[PDB]
Amino acid sequence: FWTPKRLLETDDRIFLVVGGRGVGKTFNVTGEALDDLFFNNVSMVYLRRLGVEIDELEKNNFITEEMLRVYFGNRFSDFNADESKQIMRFSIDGAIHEIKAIRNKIFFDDRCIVYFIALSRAGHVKSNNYPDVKYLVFDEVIIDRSIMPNARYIRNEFTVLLNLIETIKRKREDFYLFMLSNVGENFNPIFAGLGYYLTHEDIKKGFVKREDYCVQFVENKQEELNMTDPFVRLGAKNRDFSNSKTNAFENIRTPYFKHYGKKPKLLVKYDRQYLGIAERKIPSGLEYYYQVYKTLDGLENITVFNNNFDTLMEDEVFLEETQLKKKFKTYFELFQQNMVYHESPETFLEWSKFVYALKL
Amino acid sequence: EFWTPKRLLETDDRIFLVVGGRGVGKTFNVTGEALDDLFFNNVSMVYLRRLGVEIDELEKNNFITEEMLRVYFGNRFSDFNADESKQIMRFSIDGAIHEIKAIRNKIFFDDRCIVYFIALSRAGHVKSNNYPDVKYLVFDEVIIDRSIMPNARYIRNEFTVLLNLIETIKRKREDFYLFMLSNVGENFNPIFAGLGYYLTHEDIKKGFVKREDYCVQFVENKQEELNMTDPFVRLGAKNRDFSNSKTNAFENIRTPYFKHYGKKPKLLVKYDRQYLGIAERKIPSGLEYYYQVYKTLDGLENITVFNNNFDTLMEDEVFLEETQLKKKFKTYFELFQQNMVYHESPETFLEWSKFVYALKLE
Amino acid sequence: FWTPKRLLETDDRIFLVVGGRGVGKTFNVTGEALDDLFFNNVSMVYLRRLGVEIDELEKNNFITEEMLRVYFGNRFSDFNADESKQIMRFSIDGAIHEIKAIRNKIFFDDRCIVYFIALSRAGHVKSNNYPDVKYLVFDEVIIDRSIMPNARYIRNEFTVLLNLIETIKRKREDFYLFMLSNVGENFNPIFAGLGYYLTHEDIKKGFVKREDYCVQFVENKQEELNMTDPFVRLGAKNRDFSNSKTNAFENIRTPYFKHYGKKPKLLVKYDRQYLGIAERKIPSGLEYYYQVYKTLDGLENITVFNNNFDTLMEDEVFLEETQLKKKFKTYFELFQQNMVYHESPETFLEWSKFVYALKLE
Amino acid sequence: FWTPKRLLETDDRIFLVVGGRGVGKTFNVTGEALDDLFFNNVSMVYLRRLGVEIDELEKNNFITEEMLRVYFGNRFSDFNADESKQIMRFSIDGAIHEIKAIRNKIFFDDRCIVYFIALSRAGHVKSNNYPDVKYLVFDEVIIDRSIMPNARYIRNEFTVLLNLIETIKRKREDFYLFMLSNVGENFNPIFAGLGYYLTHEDIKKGFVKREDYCVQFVENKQEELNMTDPFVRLGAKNRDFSNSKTNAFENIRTPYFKHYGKKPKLLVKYDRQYLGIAERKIPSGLEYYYQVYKTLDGLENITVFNNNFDTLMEDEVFLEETQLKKKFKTYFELFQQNMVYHESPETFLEWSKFVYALKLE
Amino acid sequence: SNEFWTPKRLLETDDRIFLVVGGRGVGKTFNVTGEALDDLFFNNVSMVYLRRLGVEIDELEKNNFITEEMLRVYFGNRFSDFNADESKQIMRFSIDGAIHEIKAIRNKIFFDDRCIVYFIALSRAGHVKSNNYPDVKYLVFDEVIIDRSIMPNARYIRNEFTVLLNLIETIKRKREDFYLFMLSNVGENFNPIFAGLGYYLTHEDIKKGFVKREDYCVQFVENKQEELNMTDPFVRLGAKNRDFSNSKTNAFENIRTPYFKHYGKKPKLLVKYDRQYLGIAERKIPSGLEYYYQVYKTLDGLENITVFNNNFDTLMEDEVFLEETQLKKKFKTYFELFQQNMVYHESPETFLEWSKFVYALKLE
């Protein structure tokens, strides 16, 4: 079982809930919000990375009779629904309420309470048609490689995400973000943008608080498997399917960490800092170290490459997008694969922001 | 005509595999028997297809037919009137007024959805979708026919995607039925590997096979006389390729080669409480391959072990990643897919098939 | 000028109409059927080889106001309404009828009477249901190279067609199939599946009767050309346009025929017979002869390839996609081009069925 | 400034209009026809080379309110229109008329008066769907390379056009064809089928008459450019755009002409004549001459290639698409670029008909 | 409120052509479309929304082109009784007590059964040279300059400006009252639109914020410096991500300034273009070779240098005809050298002349 009520008590307005596959995190987040959506004149936005995730989604059953029964209990009554017209009719507290699903929106008493959006299509939703939105739920935020073999994150995904947060949330203090992931691993833009490094010790804690967001890990429910049912036995016989259920933390993609004293081969100035790559000669080949330097101390003659022309100065060489791909592509490949040593987790996150921001 | 799912439903098993009997209207009869439940027992149905086009090209309009309503409800069916332009059917059963409307990928009976159309290719994205009262799931054309379709490929880790859909479509429902309908029956398909069924001519002769979790039935085309007064029938008989198709359900069952090799395998992969090994035996013409299964790592101290799962990875085993499996296991998978390797026994062949299809790439 | 009224009187239920481009073969076949579709509760299916043929087709103009008037004459009236809804409101015998065309269907009084289908997509519609189809029209059955530069027949097209006949036609004695071709030539799967060899002698006769089907040839009507009209004079000056009207039978793709005594290099067992290819060394290079042998007499040690695993036996070599491409790809190309000798037209038809059944693109 | 009243008065029924960019030739031609379409029970067909030219065309605004006012003046009144449903309602002479534009048709009082067709889609259309067509307008008949960078003529375009003329016009003496081109140049299929060789001397006259058609040249008006308007000033500053206005006759693609006595290397029999290519060895390389021979005199042993199997005879070698691409593909390219010598303009037009009829691309 | 950019100041000026660059996320399209509404709704004038590529329009949501907030902002109190049908994508509302409905179908938006907005793609503009647009008063070319960040390899149309000018003629016929709005999120040189206008982008102009020319006016939109609340976590998260923060001020990150130098020696080749002669000079240097792009008003001291003429009509004397096949063989490398900042231009004026020539004849 899982509920958002505990997190909503905390001051933080941003939550990352990872794990607990099949525990209905999306059901519970939507259910707890209902009272606000129905009667506090606030909306919700359901976000997905790709349009296909929403086009194939069954909007009509996003809100269910059972969901209304669980969250409103006895107050819920007189349920009658016309699935053919995507209309739900019921009574709460004796009042008559009707829920209608149209195109990519859900309406409660002729007022939109849920908006369905795809990050791929975020650019066209630049119109501010989101006045009353109080909740944003980004389901399946982290790609599952097991379930999907070749799913790719959006180019500069976090920048696209942050733009959508701003468009939907405008000078609105009362706003909430609920990123939900079935799988938790490192080396994803969402983790880099947040600044969160996933470690087994944090998973053991189960709850993690940070300056701008809160991270929670959900333990998969130990529900018994009925062996009288053949379908349960069939699933148990297939190991790949059975392992999937508990594969949330199968691999967290921990990176290699090592320290190299020697000065770096090259530097790139990004975000008030200089990122450096150091090559160490070893008999087999080369050992790569990725480092961050706060100031250009002891690096007088090392060339500095600047992605941004506006902040370009002194003897730095302007690196254009085509020129940058020519040289840092191999270094980027080394970063994507766990083939380089990182000075510390803090440095690893700075490098991740740069790679994913500029990745092509 | 003669085949009906009434006999299978009498059996306790809730999972059925129906092979053969092409053109016998297996889908038609399965849908008709369910109608009584869908119309009056408040249970929905899901029609499943491997690819979206299989559904996009499907005529949802005629999925339920007037003849179908008449045959299964007989005299109780009356006053049939339909507006095909608006995809609306209006009829009477037992004196009540019922209207069937088909819109997009759903069919509605009296304002209640009774049939859902879904494609396994798009199943992954609908892992959160809700289907309240589904009692029947029908996977038509479960086994690809190479003759009818030249180059159709199974989905990556297809059986896992199917099992996830079973869980999504079926949630805490003891009363559920799954129907797998295949016009062609052959080995070397993921559906057969996931079930654990090895197709053999001996089983086909019996015509009925029962297993712990599922039941398999084979439909033999009736050797019915062909009316020669009709010209269309005569034209088909003259064409051998078309005529063979009628009885080509079991033309080739893709039986694999079996032999035993004593020597130790070249490499090992740890899968499902066991170790799978590949053995290479040098022969003058070229090389010989043997696929074996070892219950324990006894006498295999220094043989390299590949582990698919990082969580259970330990000691000196090599982690199996998409890049690593392609480098080493790409050729071996091709050798397995083609009937180019020796298998210790049919039991081992099924173990290898699950592993190959789970990690196979395309 | 041409209509299928005469053919429908005949007992045969399968007809092949070749030639007569611009004679409204589609119109007359569709017009004569109307009485059945409108009042006899029978549907029609319009078939095309490729989806592209139907996607570009204008379904709403499949039935025209002119069409209704010609076939129903005085009985038809009150056609002055078009509502942009694909609806045509008119009168026959005083009754009010409305024809609505939506997507790939045409509806008459809320009942679908015409279905548009592409043979490429027939495989996916094996489970599709067509309740009351009585007519199937395969228009432009034979590819026109001039009009269409590079159109390719479907793999095992005739088997796909026969399967579609079965799906569209189930337990129906009263069924009609119309194959309409603007051009008639050999070396096409449709002709091979039927068993018809196109010869100039048959075209002059104009009528050919067979066990399972009837073939009729439509000659473009001869007309004096009014030269007072400038448009006619302009056309006469362009030779290509003038040639096009009589180009229906310009080339019938006749193959070379010769008999070679020597034993064949290889044999393939197909359809209760053995097909053999014989290679004869000549100073310039090699000569090819395609032969059929009733029995394996005097061919004891020649290798035999069997396409069907079920009938495979003894020392025959299993024929799979890899094996046939390795050995039969060049032979199939030699067959497609008029580069081999055939024992007789009968043997040529046997080889054509085999090539097209197993050919890959 | 320009109207087709003068051309319609002339006996010729086929007209080619070149030049006069921005003079609203299509607008004015459509307006003059209206009286016939509205009250004389005759339809019109608007033709374009490619489908998008029509798909992107605004059918609703093909006939405009301003156009009705201009052509009917005071008689036009009580205008009310629903653009959302593409319906126009107005009164002419006190009567109530409504124009409905739906799909590829425009309806005037529930009678279609304009049909939109694309030559690419011409194959799909039959003569049944067009009862009373009196006007055919082929706009932008000659491709403009400045506005459209890479538009290609249809294969055997003139034959496709002539077939469409026959389909749209059947046994109709009262028919008119308008070919409208912003730019006029040689080496295009339409000019070749007509038989017209474009020369500057013809342009100066402004009017050219032939047996079957009439050619008129419209020069863009040399009216002063208002510099108070900023948009006009901006266009003048851009020379490429400014040149385009008067670029109708910028380059007429005149061919090179020379005579070579020696006999040709090869001959092809086309349209009751023999076309020959002569190669002359020169120190730099090779020189090409394209010739036409009325009779096979002095060419006894030169090989002759015949495209048409029906006319194939004696020792001529059959020409097929694969074979001709091997030999005539380079020659067609040498012809397309001004790299060959033509005996005379008459021969150039004969060679042009052959090249474009069999050209592939 | 005052923060957002609006074209009220621009409309007061006599100029009818405006170029607006920068101000991403300031609703330039929103405000321009909103101010026009009064004309579109009640002055019987239509609007045309232009985009370079068809995908830009096919993916565009026409239904949200006009929004309730736009109507409420621009009509203020007069706007009331807003009720829209989501199924039909029909908006219904009240202005001044009158009944108005905005319906969007296909590539058109209809106001009270009258089309007020047309969506057109410059790629498809060529074939619509005969199209009729009766009462268009506003033409808006949004995203006129391609953004490399948002779109990785989007190509300008061949001879784009000539295609654009032709579309202006088709949309605007004998209409003195016409307005053209060019909206760009990013501003840079080496683009065809800036070349056709004749505008050279320089940092000094951006600081001024306003630039006036004979036929057009250029304005630069600066993102309003609104303070960022750091108590809100969402704001802090955005500040931590430099890429998101940089994107707001990346309008003028790189203006692609060209290199300029003068070479005395006579040019290797000449092309006669637009009543002038363009010459390319190659200078041998130890490292390799150096390129200079020059313009000569007259053929003085260039007697024997070959001249290439694109236009047959003005071809004369010993000039060599320039044809599509000939130009590709030699000017392909030169066009590439120009596209990259690898050549020296005599001055910004010459660079603009060279840009007109390159893009007119450029191929892709």
Author numbering:
A (entry chain B): 8 to 367
B (entry chain C): 7 to 368
C (entry chain D), D (entry chain E): 8 to 368
E (entry chain A): 5 to 368
Paper text:
Two crystal forms of gp11 were obtained: (i) tetragonal crystals belonging to space group P43212 and (ii) trigonal crystals belonging to space group P3221. While the three structures described here were determined in the absence of nucleotide, the active sites of ASCE ATPases are well characterized and can be accurately identified. Two distinct conformations of the Walker A motif are apparent in our crystal structures. One conformation binds either a SO42− or PO43− ion in the canonical β-phosphate position. The ion forms hydrogen bonds with the backbone of the Walker A motif in lieu of a β-phosphate, typically provided by ATP or ADP, which explains why the Walker A backbone adopts a conformation similar to a typical nucleotide-bound ATPase configuration. However, because the structure was solved in absence of nucleotide or nucleotide analog, it lacks any interactions mediated by the α- and γ-phosphates, ribose sugar, or adenosine base. Thus, this structure likely represents a conformation with mixed characteristics from both the apo and nucleotide-bound configurations. However, the crystal structure of asccφ28 gp11 ring reported here shows no such helicity in the N- or C-terminal domains. We suspect that we do not observe helicity in the crystal structures due to lack of substrate DNA imparting helicity.
